[PDB]
Amino acid sequence: GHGVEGRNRPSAPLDSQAAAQVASTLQALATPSRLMILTQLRNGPLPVTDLAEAIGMEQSAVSHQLRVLRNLGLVVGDRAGRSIVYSLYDTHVAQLLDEAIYHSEHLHLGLSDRHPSAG
Amino acid sequence: GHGVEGRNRPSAPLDSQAAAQVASTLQALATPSRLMILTQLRNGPLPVTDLAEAIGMEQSAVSHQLRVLRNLGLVVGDRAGRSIVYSLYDTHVAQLLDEAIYHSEHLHLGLSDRHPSAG
């Protein structure tokens, strides 16, 4: 019987933790393929069959991807009879993406010149 | 003589590209250690000697870290006599971090229960 304590006047959080925590968030959110799928949903709700038609037969990879993220959260799915809708847990992530994508899509501060094979 | 074309009525950008591009941004920004250092600077300008004192003798790792990011940008350094100040290229990244950090620090939607060794 470990027991519980609930709230204990929590305050003054660690620093290294916030970094690590954020790292994981900014890490997962990353992933090229993951973003592509996320962006698709960002547009609006849609079934796996639709997401596949847009890409090209990948409804299976979608169901699996969402399932994984579902366990970790960040995303949620709504079961409806013989149809399951997959969407983001909340607009939070969306808002962050909107700022990053918008600010990034705005101009082109970052550049990547074709590096030589020797490099 | 490859030549140049400059602007050519650019529009309708690719999708897979935006995802990959963002992935790199959200990927680099990640990194626990990198965030810790970034957060420190986010607070305000400061020399390596000061950054080390805050951590514990790591002014060298800082100079190298900034140097790397410096080549890729995202960050900028201002040389001043016998003192160099390292800071973020712009507030852009800062703004994005503010939203993510603030939204994340707000509550605790994401959770990570101690998984079993068998897992």
UniProtKB/Swiss-Prot annotation, chains A, B:
Residue ranges of domain HTH arsR-type in the record: 14-108
Family matches, as Gene3D superfamilies: Winged helix-like DNA-binding domain superfamily/Winged helix DNA-binding domain (1.10.10.10)
A single MF term (Gene Ontology): DNA-binding transcription factor activity
Annotated Ni(2+) binding sites: 90, 92, 103, 106
Mutation effect (residue 106 to R): No change in activity. Lack of regulation by metal ions
Keyword match DNA-binding: yes
Activity regulation note: Binding to DNA is inhibited by nickel and, to some extent, cobalt ions.
SMART domains: HTH_ARSR
Record keywords, A-Z: DNA-binding, Metal-binding, Nickel, Repressor, Transcription, Transcription regulation
Pfam family, one: HTH_5
Covalent S-S links between cysteines: none
CDD domains per the UniProt record, alphabetical: HTH_ARSR
DNA-binding region: 48-71
InterPro entries, per the entry: ArsR-like_HTH (IPR011991), HTH_ArsR_DNA-bd_dom (IPR001845), Metal_resp_trans_reg (IPR051011), WH-like_DNA-bd_sf (IPR036388), WH_DNA-bd_sf (IPR036390)
Quaternary structure and interacting proteins, as annotated: Homodimer.
Record PANTHER family: ARSENICAL RESISTANCE OPERON REPRESSOR ARSR-RELATED, HTH-TYPE TRANSCRIPTIONAL REPRESSOR CZRA
Function: Represses transcription of ctpJ/nmtA, by binding to its promoter region.
Protein name in UniProt: HTH-type transcriptional regulator NmtR
Top-level taxonomy: Bacteria, Bacillati, Actinomycetota, Actinomycetes, Mycobacteriales
Gene giving rise to this polypeptide: nmtR
